[PDB]
Amino acid sequence: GSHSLRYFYTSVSRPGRGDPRFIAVGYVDDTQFVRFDSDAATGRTEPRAPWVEQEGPEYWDGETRKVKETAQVYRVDLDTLRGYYNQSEAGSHTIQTMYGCDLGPGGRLLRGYRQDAYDGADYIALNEDLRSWTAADTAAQITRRKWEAAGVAELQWRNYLETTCVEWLQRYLEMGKETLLRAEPPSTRVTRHPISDHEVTLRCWALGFYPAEITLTWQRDGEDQTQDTEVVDTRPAGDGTFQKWAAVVVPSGQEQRYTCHVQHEGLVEP
């Protein structure tokens, strides 16, 4: 799929139990490769995928150095936002950031994004032109001014997303192709679980697939039963792949009238 590199920071203030919690994690597509928890005994950014454990100490030390400095920056953001909203030091509060890049062909950035959140709601957001900011309340307009006068968007965020981000996505891709480019189609199947005299639940399965994207669709002899279909949210297996199912309650027998169809990448046919 349209490849992506993305990072997720989560900053949470623990009052007055000492220092703020911080967690950063990296994803190439739907595969996690790095993490940093400011509570781990290591004090280090760590790998989460095998294919990145080849990168040298310069990487990790380079990475560890950087994400400690980000953590301090967020720690102070907690008390600035607490100040903007007239909130007390007694409350716990959360700051969230996500930034990253979708790869275009020819080694081009296709789309850059970077976006913050305070206490679950939006705050500030880099717009798609990589120059402007969207500020969702008075507070974040204070934040906006400061980053307009500094050129944060075009000078440091545009630049990062248009080169480092892109180049490094292509580096994780190449260094991990045996996994991040392997088509993994869903082992797919149906099961029936009766309900009464009339009824019987048909449940179409789809396990062990990558990436998470998928569609499971029941047809009533040609016609999509959506939205009479119970479709559970795509969920992790634990081994790097995913699983989903959709269920439809049918009058027995009349289930020969029913068929399930699965669209996914790993069902490639040229």
């Binding site: 400095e69 936002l81 930034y99 480092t164």
Partner: peptide, 9 residues
């Protein structure tokens, strides 16, 4: 690669 050099809020 992690972004760095963030201007504080």
């Amino acid at each position: 690669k992690l972004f760095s050099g963030e201007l504080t809020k």
